[PDB]
Scaffold this active site. Sequence first.
Site, mmCIF file in Angstrom:
data_model
loop_
_atom_site.group_PDB
_atom_site.id
_atom_site.type_symbol
_atom_site.label_atom_id
_atom_site.label_comp_id
_atom_site.label_asym_id
_atom_site.label_seq_id
_atom_site.Cartn_x
_atom_site.Cartn_y
_atom_site.Cartn_z
ATOM 1 N N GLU A 36 1.501 -13.489 36.138
ATOM 2 C CA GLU A 36 1.856 -13.412 34.668
ATOM 3 C C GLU A 36 2.957 -15.000 34.932
ATOM 4 O O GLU A 36 2.347 -15.065 33.916
ATOM 5 C CB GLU A 36 3.388 -11.851 35.033
ATOM 6 C CG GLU A 36 3.211 -10.698 34.874
ATOM 7 C CD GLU A 36 2.281 -11.077 33.379
ATOM 8 O OE1 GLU A 36 2.281 -12.223 32.455
ATOM 9 O OE2 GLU A 36 1.570 -9.674 32.127
ATOM 10 N N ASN A 47 5.455 -16.641 21.724
ATOM 11 C CA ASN A 47 3.873 -15.904 21.063
ATOM 12 C C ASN A 47 4.125 -15.942 19.537
ATOM 13 O O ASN A 47 5.104 -16.700 19.240
ATOM 14 C CB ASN A 47 3.703 -14.755 21.835
ATOM 15 C CG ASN A 47 3.878 -14.294 22.593
ATOM 16 O OD1 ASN A 47 2.843 -15.186 23.553
ATOM 17 N ND2 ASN A 47 4.809 -13.659 23.781
ATOM 18 N N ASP A 49 3.523 -13.456 17.904
ATOM 19 C CA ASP A 49 4.303 -12.900 16.881
ATOM 20 C C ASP A 49 6.129 -13.277 16.435
ATOM 21 O O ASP A 49 6.708 -12.506 16.263
ATOM 22 C CB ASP A 49 3.903 -10.730 16.994
ATOM 23 C CG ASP A 49 4.406 -11.025 19.056
ATOM 24 O OD1 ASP A 49 5.197 -11.946 19.146
ATOM 25 O OD2 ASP A 49 4.669 -9.802 19.061
ATOM 26 N N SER A 51 8.112 -13.179 19.170
ATOM 27 C CA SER A 51 8.142 -12.933 20.691
ATOM 28 C C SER A 51 7.780 -13.813 21.688
ATOM 29 O O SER A 51 6.998 -14.380 21.499
ATOM 30 C CB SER A 51 7.786 -11.444 21.166
ATOM 31 O OG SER A 51 6.369 -11.281 21.564
ATOM 32 N N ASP A 53 8.058 -14.165 26.560
ATOM 33 C CA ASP A 53 7.980 -13.901 27.583
ATOM 34 C C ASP A 53 8.653 -14.298 28.488
ATOM 35 O O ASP A 53 8.781 -15.339 28.307
ATOM 36 C CB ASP A 53 6.312 -13.362 28.087
ATOM 37 C CG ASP A 53 5.073 -12.859 27.391
ATOM 38 O OD1 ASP A 53 5.096 -11.786 26.220
ATOM 39 O OD2 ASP A 53 3.994 -12.957 26.693
ATOM 40 N N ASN A 60 8.570 -8.801 28.300
ATOM 41 C CA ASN A 60 8.605 -9.316 26.674
ATOM 42 C C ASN A 60 10.287 -9.450 25.830
ATOM 43 O O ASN A 60 10.609 -7.705 25.573
ATOM 44 C CB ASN A 60 7.421 -8.640 25.443
ATOM 45 C CG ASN A 60 6.613 -8.753 24.196
ATOM 46 O OD1 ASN A 60 7.409 -8.506 23.100
ATOM 47 N ND2 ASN A 60 6.429 -10.423 24.377
ATOM 48 N N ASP A 102 9.404 3.858 31.229
ATOM 49 C CA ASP A 102 8.968 3.915 29.180
ATOM 50 C C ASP A 102 7.935 2.994 28.642
ATOM 51 O O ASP A 102 7.942 3.612 27.334
ATOM 52 C CB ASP A 102 10.379 3.473 29.070
ATOM 53 C CG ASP A 102 11.732 4.280 29.601
ATOM 54 O OD1 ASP A 102 11.967 3.683 30.812
ATOM 55 O OD2 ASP A 102 12.500 5.331 29.231
#
Length: 130
Positions: A36, A47, A49, A51, A53, A60, A102
């Site tokens: 990562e 990114n 979208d 968002s 990281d 994210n 989750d």
Amino acid sequence: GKVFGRCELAAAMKRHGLDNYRGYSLGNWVCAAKFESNFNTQATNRNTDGSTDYGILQINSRWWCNDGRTPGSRNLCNIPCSALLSSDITASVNCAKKIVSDGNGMNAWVAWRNRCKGTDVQAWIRGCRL
């Protein structure tokens, strides 16, 4: 700043309960960080979208941390994304635990999928004093 080494990170992750957590042996977690972020606590990847990281585990900002700039924010770790850029890994490990518990396990981490999933992940902690 801080860039970890593999055994240094393995030890820290083990201290905070990641070995076998939710079915993922410790080498999975070290491997995920390796691919990562190359162990860089301040790695950040913005990114298309909207968002971003953040940190050593590239967590994210849509579902998990809040950066105030991301559509659809859920902030499920209840944590400012800033905290995930810290030199110590506590906040990233805390959030990683909630991730893996989750969504879809470690599939959340595309680098885990691409470079760790199903490999000899014990290699990442081999020889480390744990």
